[PDB]
Design a protein around this ligand. Structure first.
Ligand SMILES: [Mg+2]
Length: 156
RNA sequence: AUGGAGAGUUUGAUCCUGGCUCAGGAUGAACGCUGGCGGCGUGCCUAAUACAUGCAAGUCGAGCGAACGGACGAGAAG
């Protein structure tokens, strides 16, 4: 499992004297073979925050249906104000994505896709929107089984 | 299918909303520094402001009369 630190953020809680600072780490973990997850970790130092985030991400993983390195179909993943449009591309296109979306897609193993963040650019909600889209993706075989037909009947 | 990336900035910290700003491409460009060559293009966007000077619409003698011109070659011998 490869892991990428998306963002590290120094948050503060106010106390009677001064402030208590902590580090929050958002991390994406993936095998580059259709499995991806994300996690957050809070600690007094960034290495420990990253370690906790990685453990949480490994706890939470999703399976991404793929077709030769790209998604089966266009999808818009939404979470809160996050919103990420994603569209299958052709080989050699590359991953046309910005910010946390690229982390999520590359670690999921997608190498050719087009995307656009249409909503909030706050990294955690961007990641959640991307994961929501990948979760709602569908594959031809599963939809054929659900609709009680064959792939050939599906495509006519 | 030939095709679509985002970032900074409101808070002690947060999410949202929201504007501002930046990274790209372009030009009949101008300016600053600098500047070797070749090829192909482009070059008063302003004052439809005023313009010295030269040139940018002539040609036809196989339409016509006239004028100039004077070969080829006549005559006298100074
Ligand atoms: Mg949680």
């Amino acid at each position: 499992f490869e892991e990428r630190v998306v963002t590290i953020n120094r948050v503060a809680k106010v106390v009677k004297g001064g402030r208590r600072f902590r580090f929050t780490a958002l991390v994406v973990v993936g095998d580059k073979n259709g499995r991806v997850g994300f996690g957050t970790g809070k600690a007094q130092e960034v290495p420990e925050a990253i370690k906790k985030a990685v453990e949480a991400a490994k706890k939470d993983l999703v399976v991404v249906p793929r077709v030769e390195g790209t998604t089966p179909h266009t999808i818009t993943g939404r979470y809160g104000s996050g919103s990420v449009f994603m569209k299958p591309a052709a080989p050699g296109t590359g991953v046309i994505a910005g910010g946390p979306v690229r982390a999520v897609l590359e670690l999921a193993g997608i190498t050719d896709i087009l995307s656009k963040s249409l909503g909030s650019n706050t990294p955690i909600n961007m990641v959640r929107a991307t994961i929501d889209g990948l979760q709602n993706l569908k594959n031809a075989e599963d939809v054929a089984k659900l609709r009680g037909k064959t792939v050939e009947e599906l495509y006519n």
